[PDB]
Amino acid sequence: MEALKRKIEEEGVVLSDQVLKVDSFLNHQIDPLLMQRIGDEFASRFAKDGITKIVTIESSGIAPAVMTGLKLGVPVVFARKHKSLTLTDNLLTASVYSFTKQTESQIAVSGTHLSDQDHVLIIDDFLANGQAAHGLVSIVKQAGASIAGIGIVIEKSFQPGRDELVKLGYRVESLARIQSLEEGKVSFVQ
Template identity: 75%
Template sequence: MEALKKKIIEEGIVLSDQVLKVDAFLNHQIDPLLMQQIGQAFAKLFRDQGITKIVTIEASGIAPAVMAGLELGVPVIFARKYQSLTLTDNLLISKVFSFTKQSESTIAVSAKHLLANDRVLLIDDFLANGRAAHGLIDLIKQAGATIVGIGVVIEKSFQKGRQELDEQGYWVESLARIQSLENGTVRFLD
C-alpha cells in the first residue's frame, strides 16, 4: 500500500534495527484518512471470506480494525489487555508478550461476543515475533471459531512472526512489509 509506505518514510522514526516508531499516524496520533484507506485495503483483500467478526488487540489495532469492519459491515471485537470491572464473566483468556514494552499482558474477550460459528479476520498494527497474533489465535480457538485470515498494517519481515504463521497455515496479508531497519533506514520487502 503506497500511501502507508510513504507515511512510514515521511513520519516513521527508526529507533533501532528492531524498532520503528509510528506514533505520528498509527499508534498514538491516528491519521483518519490513512486508516480509512487501510480499512478499504483489508476489505478488498478479505471480502470473499464470509467474515462475521474482526478481532484485534487494544489499543493500536483498534483503528484499522474498525475501519475494516466498517467496510465489511461486521462487528469488531478488541481483546482487552487488562481486567475491568465490567469484563468479568465467561471470558476467553490468553497471554501476550510485548517486545516493545518488554512485558507480558493477559488479554481477554467475552465469550458471548465470539461464537463457534464465527468466521474471524484478525487485524493488528504490527507483526514482528507474532506473540500478539498467537494470543488472538488462542482466544479464537477457545471459542471454536474459524480464522479466515490475518491482516497486518506493518510487518517486520526480518523477524520470525510471519514465518511461524505461514508454517501453521494461516493466510497473512501485510500492507507494508519491512525488510530492514538497519542504519536508521526503512527498506521495504516489496
C-alpha cells in the same frame, strides 16, 4: 499500499534496527483518512472470505480494525488487558509477551462476543515475533470460531513472527513489509 509506504518513509522514525516508531499516524496520533484506506485495503483482500467479525487488540489495532469492519459491514471486537482477581464466567484469555516492553500480560475477550459460527478476521498494527497474533488466534479458537486470516498493517519481515505464524496455515496479509531498519532507514521487501 503506496499510501502507507510513503507515510512510513516520510514520517516513520527508526528507533533502532529492531523498532519503527510511527506515532505520528498510527500508534498515538491517528490519521483517519489513512486508516480508512487501510481498512478498505484489508476488506478488499478478504471481501469474499465470508468474514462475520473482526478481532483485534487495544489499542493501536482498533482504528485499522474499525475501518475494516465498516467497509465489510461486520462488528469489531478488541481484546483487552486483563489479570484481575475474580471469577469471570465465560472469558476467553491468552498470555502475550510485549515485544516492545519485554513484559508479559494477559489479554481477554468476553465469550459472549464470539460464537463457533463466527468466521473471524484478525487485525493488528505490527507483526514482530508474533506473540500478539498467536494470542488472538488462541482466543478465537477457544470460542470454536474459525479464522479467515490475519491482517497486519506493518510487518517486520526480518523478524521471526511472520514465518512462525504462517506455520499454522492462516493467510497472513501485511500491508507494508519491512526488510530492514538498519542504518536508521526503512527498506521494504522487494
